[PDB]
Amino acid sequence: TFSEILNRVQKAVDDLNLHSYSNLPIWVNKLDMEIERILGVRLQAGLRAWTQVLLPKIKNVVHELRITNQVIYLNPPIEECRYKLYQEMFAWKMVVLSLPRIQSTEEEKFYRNALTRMPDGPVALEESYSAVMGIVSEVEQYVKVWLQYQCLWDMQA
Amino acid sequence: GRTGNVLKLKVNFLPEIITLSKEVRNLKWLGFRVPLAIVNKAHQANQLYPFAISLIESVRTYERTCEKVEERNTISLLVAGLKKEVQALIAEGIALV
């Protein structure tokens, strides 16, 4: 829906351009500034909703514990769950961040500045990131003592 | 509605003058002879009326559309070029007698 709105807006801008009006680029720049501010606000709302979901559709990440040669092992490891969570949050970010810019390089092609356009500053990002070592930390904690049971094999009869 | 003194643009042409011409344009055939000065003035006003009415309608339309533009400040930046060319044309015209 965001891409469609941007496409229609850019089509209207191009229609204005072909009519050969006056002073287009500065108007385009101000419109882009406003739309990026609105995008930053919407991204803040979505990111905070995603965070409170962690604490927005989220995929369910799952990993198991098994044993081989009488050793407890993880499949995939906890750091792998960490990386999956970071990848999913990144995808949620580029849902809005991958939106193309409006124009008459990589940064100029599509808008990547909303993080600096954040109405509440990096805090809204940070808290999101923060929830990460909520979850994973408890995870490894909950694993640790449980994993401790493997020591029983290290100690022969 | 505004404390400042608005310098509204008008046209140096009374709309009523043509009426006088019409009076002459009616009284000439009625049998009444009017002074030659009145005849010349009425004829000149009659022949020059279309230009004056065109100017006054044009300036009124321009004032209406420009106040409409300034009603929405988001567009004056784009319309500045057309406003500049219209102002230049007005500046050229005003110096004329």
Partner: peptide, 28 residues
């Protein structure tokens, strides 16, 4: 050397132009 757009088209508020032309008509 990426060139940037120069000074944009100005507004020149109608009041200023009107008063300047008042002056010009006054001295003519």
């Amino acid at each position: 050397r990426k060139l940037v757009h120069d000074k944009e088209l100005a507004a020149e508020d109608e009041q200023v132009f009107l008063m300047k032309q008042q002056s010009l008509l006054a001295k003519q």
